[PDB]
Amino acid sequence: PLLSASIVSAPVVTSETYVDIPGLYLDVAKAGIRDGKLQVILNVPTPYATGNNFPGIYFAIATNQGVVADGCFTYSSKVPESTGRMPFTLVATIDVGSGVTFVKGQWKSVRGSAMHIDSYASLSAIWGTA
Amino acid sequence: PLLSASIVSAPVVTSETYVDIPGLYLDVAKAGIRDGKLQVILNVPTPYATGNNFPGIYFAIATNQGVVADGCFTYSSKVPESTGRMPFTLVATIDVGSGVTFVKGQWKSVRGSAMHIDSYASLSAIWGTAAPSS
Amino acid sequence: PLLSASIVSAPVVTSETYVDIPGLYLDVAKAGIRDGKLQVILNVPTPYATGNNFPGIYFAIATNQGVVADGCFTYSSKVPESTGRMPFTLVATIDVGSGVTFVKGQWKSVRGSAMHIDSYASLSAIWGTAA
Ligand SMILES: C[Se][C@@H]1O[C@@H](C)[C@@H](O)[C@@H](O)[C@@H]1O
Ligand SMILES: C[Se][C@@H]1O[C@@H](C)[C@@H](O)[C@@H](O)[C@@H]1O
Ligand SMILES: C[Se][C@@H]1O[C@@H](C)[C@@H](O)[C@@H](O)[C@@H]1O
Ligand SMILES: [Br-]
Numbered sequence: 001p002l003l004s005a006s007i008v009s010a011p012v013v014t015s016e017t018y019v020d021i022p023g024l025y026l027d028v029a030k031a032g033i034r035d036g037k038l039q040v041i042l043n044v045p046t047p048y049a050t051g052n053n054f055p056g057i058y059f060a061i062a063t064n065q066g067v068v069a070d071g072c073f074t075y076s077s078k079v080p081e082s083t084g085r086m087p088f089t090l091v092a093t094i095d096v097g098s099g100v101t102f103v104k105g106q107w108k109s110v111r112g113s114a115m116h117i118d119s120y121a122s123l124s125a126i127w128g129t130a
Numbered sequence: 131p132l133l134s135a136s137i138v139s140a141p142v143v144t145s146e147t148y149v150d151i152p153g154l155y156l157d158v159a160k161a162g163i164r165d166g167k168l169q170v171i172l173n174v175p176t177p178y179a180t181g182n183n184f185p186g187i188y189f190a191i192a193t194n195q196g197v198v199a200d201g202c203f204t205y206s207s208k209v210p211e212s213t214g215r216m217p218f219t220l221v222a223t224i225d226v227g228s229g230v231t232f233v234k235g236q237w238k239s240v241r242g243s244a245m246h247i248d249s250y251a252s253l254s255a256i257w258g259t260a261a262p263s264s
Numbered sequence: 265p266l267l268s269a270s271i272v273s274a275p276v277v278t279s280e281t282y283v284d285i286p287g288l289y290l291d292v293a294k295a296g297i298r299d300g301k302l303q304v305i306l307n308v309p310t311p312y313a314t315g316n317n318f319p320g321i322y323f324a325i326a327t328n329q330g331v332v333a334d335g336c337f338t339y340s341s342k343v344p345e346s347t348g349r350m351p352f353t354l355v356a357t358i359d360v361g362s363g364v365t366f367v368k369g370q371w372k373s374v375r376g377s378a379m380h381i382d383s384y385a386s387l388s389a390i391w392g393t394a395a
Binding site for chain 2: 001002003004006031032041043045046057075076077080081083084085086087089119120122124126130
C-alpha cells in the first residue's frame, strides 16, 4: 500500500525541541502495516525561517521510538536580506517493527528561528518487502 | 508499475502563469492505468532563476484536472551576486480513478524571473493502492 | 522489493571527479531483483560545501554502467558568510535485468570545494514493472 498526508499551512512556531508539524502524520497500523519496510518521504518544498543568527529549520521523521532521521536547511548570511524559500526533502526507509504504528514529521528551531509553512507540504510512504 | 520522464535541458522562459516544463510529462492513459493511485515526484535538482527582485521559480504537478501541488524556491538577496543552484523536489499522491489521463511538471516565475534548467530533471510515478478498510 | 542504504556521516573529501559516497550503495545483484525497473532516490538533506569561489557539490546516481543522473547545489555568494545547509535530492529510474548490478551515490566538487555530510543521508529504490 501507499500512504499520503498533505497540508497547505502550519502554525508559525518556535521550539528548541522537536514538535509535531500538524497534519503530517501517517497511521501505519490503521493501514494494516505491521512489518516489512516503509520508504517515508517528508517533503516541505517551500519553507522559510526567520531569525537573527543564520536562521534555519531542523526537520525529523519520527515514529513511536522517536526521531529516526533528521536534517536541516540554514541560510548562509547572518541576517538574510529576505528569508527565501528553501526546499527541503528528507527520505528514510524504516523497518516496521512491532512497536512502529505511525510515522510523522516534526521540526525544531535553528538558533531561535520561527518556522514557516504557508503552502503545500507532504508526508508520504510506500510499503515494500526486504 | 513505474513511470518516468527525464530531460537534461529546457529553453529559458519567463511566464506569469504555469507552463509545461518540456519533456516532463507522463501519459497515464497510454500506460493503461485507470485505477489506484500514483505517488508522483517532480525532481528539479539544479535549477536557477535570474531576475531583478529576489528571483525564484514555482514548480507544480498538474493533471488534466488541474494543479495538484506546487511550491517554489527563492533567493535571499535582492540581486544575488551569483544565482546559485537551488535543488527542488515536490511529492504528491493522486487518485487515477478520478479521471486522470496525464501528469505534468510545470513552472512559473517568481517576480518576473527567467527560469533555467540546463541539466537533468525528472518526473516519476509509482503506482499503488490505499490499504482496504473493513 | 524496497532497497535502502543510509549513513549519518562521510569523510570530507575534495575531488575533481565523481567519487563514491561510502555506504550509499545498493547491491541489486545480491537482491535478486526480478526484471523491471527501479525508482532510485538519492537524498542528501543536510550537506554543505567549503571553498572560496562560489562553493557547491555535484551529486550523481551511478550504476556499474555509469552515471545515470546528476545535479548540484551551489551558493549564491563567492565566499559565503557561513556555508549553510543545502538540501539535495535526485531521482532517477533505471532498468533491472539488462546488466545493472549495483546503484550508488557519488559526488564531486564544484570549483574545488570540500564536501561535507555529517548527518542522515540515504539511497533507496523501489522496484516495479515497466508501463
Ligand atoms: C510573501 Se513573498 C515569499 O515569502 C517571503 C518570506 C520570501 O521567502 C519570498 O522570497 C517569497 O516569495
Ligand atoms: C555556469 Se557556473 C553554474 O551556473 C551559475 C548560474 C551558478 O548557479 C553557479 O553556481 C553554477 O556553478
Ligand atoms: C555546527 Se552549525 C551548522 O553547520 C554549519 C557548517 C552551518 O551549515 C550552520 O548553518 C549549521 O547550523
Ligand atoms: Br486506491
